[PDB]
Structure 1
Amino acid sequence: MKGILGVKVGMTRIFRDDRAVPVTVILAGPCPVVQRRTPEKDGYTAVQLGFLPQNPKRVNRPLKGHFAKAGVEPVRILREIRDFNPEGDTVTVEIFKPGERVDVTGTSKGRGFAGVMKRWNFAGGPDSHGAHKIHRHPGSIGNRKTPGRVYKGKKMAGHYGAERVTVMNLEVVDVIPEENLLLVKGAVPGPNGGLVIVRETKKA
């Protein structure tokens, strides 16, 4: 189980065997191993990765001490890759080869307060035939005196997106190591410039 931190660059498409391949470009390299979680000390196995160097003028003393114990320049983002013990003290795009399948995790785009139609694909109401101020309303939310209430988990309007989403089993189309570029086939959660995480697929 290998993994790396990255940033969504943007989408484009390449040509490969006379086919347009939709790709999302990710800038993944390089990630210094900042701490390794071990069964002896932490009860589990994981590598705390760093990503993007940070202006040391903005790094308070608790964090500076944390980087110091690793001999690592101050970094913007710390994320652990679970069950991953890389050999070196740095993780780069090289851990992926074209043809492999990866899982990408990002933070979806935030719809804010979202209606029942956008959020849950509800049908809403009719737009004519007398429909009275309910065109985007959810309809009934219950029964009558039995059970006399509304279920937990009831699909209602509310906030939507800006949540952790993992899309799975994406093809690694290319690895351009001189630019720390990973090219993945298909779509990846969140906006351009968003932080993403690239793990080896759990699909088999």
Structure 2
Amino acid sequence: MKGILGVKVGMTRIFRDDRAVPVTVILAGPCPVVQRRTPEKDGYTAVQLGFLPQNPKRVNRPLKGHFAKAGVEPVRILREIRDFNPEGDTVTVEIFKPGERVDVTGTSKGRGFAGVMKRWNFAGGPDSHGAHKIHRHPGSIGNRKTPGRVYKGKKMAGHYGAERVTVMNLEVVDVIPEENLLLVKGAVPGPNGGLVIVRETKKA
């Protein structure tokens, strides 16, 4: 159940057997394991990974202790991968070979307060024929006296994006260990520069 932290760098395509392959490039290596969570100690199993080096000037004292106890130089992000336990004290892109399928988790781009047409692909209202100031409105939200209320979960306008999203079963197109690059075919949540997690896929 291997996994790794990384940053989305950007997309392009490569050519592979006279085929254009759209890819997102992820900087993944190298992630120092900084804690192991164990069934005896913690009740479950996983690896806290760290990623990108941090200026010690900016690391407070409780954090420093945590890093110290690992003999690990301070790092900007800590995140766990569950049910993964690497033999090394460091995880790098090498844990993936081209051909493998992965799941990538990102924080999606933020749309802010979104209307119903962008959030939920509502149809909105006519643009003419008499529609009166309701071209992007949701329409009805209910019945009448029965039930006299609006369902929990009713799709409505509101904040949208900047959310955890995990896209699944992406092909690993290539891995360039010398530069800590993982090339995954397709699209990955969030902006370039955003933090992502690459896991072995759960599909078969």
Using structure 2 for the length normalisation, give the TM-score: 1.00
Q: Secondary structure at the match of 1:147?
A: coil
Cα separation, 1, equivalents of 2:9 and 2:64 = 29
Structure 1 residues 109-135: Cα deviation after superposition (integer angstroms, max 9, x where no partner): 000000000000000000000000000
Whole-angstrom distance in 2 between the partners of 1:161 and 1:122: 17
Q: Deviations over 1:75-122 (max 9, x none)?
A: 000000000000000000000000000000000000000000000000
**1:5 to partner: Cα distance:** 0.2
- How far did residue 46 of structure 1 move? 0.3
CA distance in 1, matches of 2:89, 2:137: 55
Q: Deviations over 1:124-177 (max 9, x none)?
A: 000000000000000000000000000000000000000000000000000000
State the Cα deviation string for residues 27-57 of structure 1 (Å, max 9, x = none): 0000000000000000000000000000000
SS of 1:94's equivalent in the other structure is: helix
**SS of alignment partner, residue 41 of structure 1:** coil
Unaligned runs of 5+ in 1: none
Gaps of 5+ in 2: none
Partners in 2 of 1:6 and 1:159 — Cα distance? 26
How many angstroms apart in 2 are the aligned matches of 1:104 and 1:38?
Answer: 24
Give distance in 2, aligned partners of 1:157 and 1:151.
15
Q: Percent identity between the aligned chains?
A: 100
Distance 1:116 1:103 in 2: 29
